[PDB]
């Protein structure tokens, strides 16, 4: 039901270096799908 705008632009020049910028972490394991407009921060081990 989203009323708003999405703005995106390429940033290869402040967020990337030769050894690799590793300050951006993208979580790929979670127990269940998130509610709308919700975050989880806690660092606990995910066993498959």
């Amino acid at each position: 039901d989203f009323t708003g705008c999405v703005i995106a632009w390429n940033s290869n020049k402040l967020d990337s270096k030769h050894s690799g910028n590793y300050d951006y972490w993208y979580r790929s394991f979670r127990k269940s799908k998130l509610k709308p407009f919700e975050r989880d921060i806690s660092t606990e081990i995910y066993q498959a």
């Binding site: 050894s19 690799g20 590793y22 790929s28």
Partner: protein, 129 residues
């Protein structure tokens, strides 16, 4: 935290076979593109193969094409190499390494020199006993 240990190696003979295995103690496979590197003594480290993060996209080098192969299994969380038709000048210290995301042949960017973030201890492989 994330260590990449190797199992295999030893003394073999030309025309023989041997198996390499790299089990990731840290982050899993099928999410990081892993690769393999070798070091001839007195010579610089050059990679031999990769497998991508997604599916089974496979690359080799020119001098090792057809003879050697790569495969992985996600349940054991390891990558496997089958050495076939071993010859004299392959005597090298073999390393396994990894990097997040598909990095081997990614656009106009092949797996040139050493760009992976993780490193392994390495095992020795010798031939012609």
């Amino acid at each position: 935290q994330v260590q990449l240990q190797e199992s295999g190696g030893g003394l073999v003979q030309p025309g023989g076979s041997l198996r390499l295995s790299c089990t990731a103690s840290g982050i899993a496979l099928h999410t990081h593109a892993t690769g393999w590197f070798r070091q001839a003594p007195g010579k610089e480290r050059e990679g031999v193969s990769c497998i991508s993060s997604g599916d089974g996209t496979t690359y080799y080098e020119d001098s090792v094409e057809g003879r050697f192969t790569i495969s992985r299994d996600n349940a054991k969380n390891t990558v496997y190499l089958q050495m076939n038709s071993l010859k004299l000048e392959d005597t090298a210290v073999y390393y396994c390494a990894a990097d997040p995301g598909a990095v081997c042949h990614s656009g106009s960017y092949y797996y040139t020199d050493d760009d992976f973030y993780y490193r392994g201890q390495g095992t020795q492989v010798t031939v012609s006993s």
